Amino acid sequence: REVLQLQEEVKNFITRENLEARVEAALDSRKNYNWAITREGLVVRPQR
Amino acid sequence: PRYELALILKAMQRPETAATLKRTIEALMDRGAIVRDLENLGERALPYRISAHSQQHNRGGYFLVDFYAPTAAVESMVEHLSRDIDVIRGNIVKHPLTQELKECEGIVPVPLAEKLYS
Amino acid sequence: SNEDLPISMENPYKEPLKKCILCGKHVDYKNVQLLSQFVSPFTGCIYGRHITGLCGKKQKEITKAIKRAQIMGFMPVTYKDPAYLKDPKVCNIRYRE
Amino acid sequence: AKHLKFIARTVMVQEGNVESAYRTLNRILTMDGLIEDIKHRRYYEKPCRRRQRESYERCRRIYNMEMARKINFLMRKNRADPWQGC
Amino acid sequence: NVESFASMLRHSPLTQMGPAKDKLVIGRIFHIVENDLYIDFGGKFHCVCRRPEVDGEKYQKGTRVRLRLLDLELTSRFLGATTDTTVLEANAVLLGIQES
Amino acid sequence: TKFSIYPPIPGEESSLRWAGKKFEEIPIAHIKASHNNTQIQVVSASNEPLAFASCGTEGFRNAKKGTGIAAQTAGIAAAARAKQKGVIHIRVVVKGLGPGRLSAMHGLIMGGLEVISITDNTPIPHXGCRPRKARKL
Numbered sequence A: 001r002e003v004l005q006l007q008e009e010v011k012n013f014i015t016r017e018n019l020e021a022r023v024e025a026a027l028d029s030r031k032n033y034n035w036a037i038t039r040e041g042l043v044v045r046p047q048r
Numbered sequence B: 001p002r003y004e005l006a007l008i009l010k011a012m013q014r015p016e017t018a019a020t021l022k023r024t025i026e027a028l029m030d031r032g033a034i035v036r037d038l039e040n041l042g043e044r045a046l047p048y049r050i051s052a053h054s055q056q057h058n059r060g061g062y063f064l065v066d067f068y069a070p071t072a073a074v075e076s077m078v079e080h081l082s083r084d085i086d087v088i089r090g091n092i093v094k095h096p097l098t099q100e101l102k103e104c105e106g107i108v109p110v111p112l113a114e115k116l117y118s
Numbered sequence C: 001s002n003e004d005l006p007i008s009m010e011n012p013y014k015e016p017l018k019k020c021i022l023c024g025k026h027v028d029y030k031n032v033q034l035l036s037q038f039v040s041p042f043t044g045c046i047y048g049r050h051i052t053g054l055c056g057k058k059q060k061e062i063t064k065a066i067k068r069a070q071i072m073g074f075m076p077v078t079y080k081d082p083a084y085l086k087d088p089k090v091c092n093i094r095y096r097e
Numbered sequence D: 001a002k003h004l005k006f007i008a009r010t011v012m013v014q015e016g017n018v019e020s021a022y023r024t025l026n027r028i029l030t031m032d033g034l035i036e037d038i039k040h041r042r043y044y045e046k047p048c049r050r051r052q053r054e055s056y057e058r059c060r061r062i063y064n065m066e067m068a069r070k071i072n073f074l075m076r077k078n079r080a081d082p083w084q085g086c
Numbered sequence E: 001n002v003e004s005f006a007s008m009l010r011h012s013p014l015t016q017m018g019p020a021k022d023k024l025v026i027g028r029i030f031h032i033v034e035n036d037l038y039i040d041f042g043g044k045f046h047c048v049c050r051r052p053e054v055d056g057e058k059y060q061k062g063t064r065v066r067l068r069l070l071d072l073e074l075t076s077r078f079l080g081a082t083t084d085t086t087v088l089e090a091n092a093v094l095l096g097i098q099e100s
Numbered sequence F: 001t002k003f004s005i006y007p008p009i010p011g012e013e014s015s016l017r018w019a020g021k022k023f024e025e026i027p028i029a030h031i032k033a034s035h036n037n038t039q040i041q042v043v044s045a046s047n048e049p050l051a052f053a054s055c056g057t058e059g060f061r062n063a064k065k066g067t068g069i070a071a072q073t074a075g076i077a078a079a080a081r082a083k084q085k086g087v088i089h090i091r092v093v094v095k096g097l098g099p100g101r102l103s104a105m106h107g108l109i110m111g112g113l114e115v116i117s118i119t120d121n122t123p124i125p126h127x128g129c130r131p132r133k134a135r136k137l
């Protein structure tokens, strides 16, 4: 099961041919790792 | 193994930032790395002033590069980033998602007698 | 023998063990918003587990995450980032007036 | 030195009450351990002495917390005598 | 056909109750000292509850009341002790009076 | 609005003003409270010096410099030279736990200046130079 999952992911891996497209496709996007926790143990995602 | 490169780039315009990322990802590939993803965390003010290559920086572009590489590539990549003038600060860590979190039943109490005895 | 005698088994009324607010959650050094909830607003000092309520395992992950984030350029050291002052207050510390 | 200024250890004055602002700042620095830290740093405390004091401080807190717990527990019966005369 | 002790214990209300924490029980005031109400609720030890501010005069000897139990016996073991210290009373919160 | 002891953050849009000046524009009174002396300098937001006073410059000598009343006198002197230059509101930055830590601020107020904030900048090394050996007294 791990080899199958890994075989699909490799389709999305960066390569020398698709390097420029993926570099530009990243400058347009934003990835947010920020989130806060509450006294009840609930995650409070950011307002975006 | 699987690594995560936390990359702070000098605040630049879009064309020069893309050239730095391409030049940085190509250096990884030249050392045998298989690059998995590239994530932009956004441009922000640094938590403190950072001096790099005879310049002072207050803002930077935060990027992540998820990739697999041989253990010997890390030392060579750390050296590569130290010479790139467009990189403010770059650190290579073992990817956090590789480490699997062990389940926790809860907080087991500690006997007080052990505390003072220990 | 006798039907009404007690039977051996595990406590059916036993309650689950307590869990810290972060039990079961991944603590990443890039999640500065979470980490900032466990440092002093005025001095940036990391709170002890008696203030944060965290267990030994998560208290260590938070501490190591804070120290990693600080020196890698993600988190300030001498103060809590003011952007995160209005986040949920999960720490048993009372400061102002 | 490299951080932003007027954020760390900064308290605003309200209605010209500078005494209350100073007391709040002193309380902040005290609770975070900065005052005791500054004082212990005037002269070098040797590692054998630092460990001994830290061990004494940790054991005294446990004994004081445990003695408070006992007094709280044994003060429930401080009510008036229910069987006076017997 | 004499009932055995094991039979009495299995079918006793106190056994059937299970844990006592957060259990509603009916108590009876048997002794009063100023504003201290001594209430028996079927357990080993009585509980002591302060007279409520509202309708304080309604609480008299013999008055049946509703309680929320917390512990049947308040005991704790303190550092350096071989046994548990007990205050010989239950922990309960007085809610009000029981009426028909 | 309720009062916030947290200072206004630069770059955000606050409504607080002092004589039409923002927090970032208020001059700064730097107080160095040492064990045996107290130094007070008032500077502008652009780091332009405006006034300087210390217990030594006010005619105090030896152990008298290390007193609260000596720092209070230095504060009044610094306030007078600063008030002439157009200073009313000041941000106080005190470094050190000397006897003139609080008294130096009192003198600034008696001299005609209004303190809008108090900041401690006492140097705390995070691990740094080895201090001198303990004293046998």
Ligand code: FES
Pocket (backbone or CB within 6 Å): B104, B105, B106, B107, C018, C019, C020, C022, C023, C024, C054, C055, C056, C057, C058
């Ligand atoms: S209680 Fe489970 S990780 Fe903290």
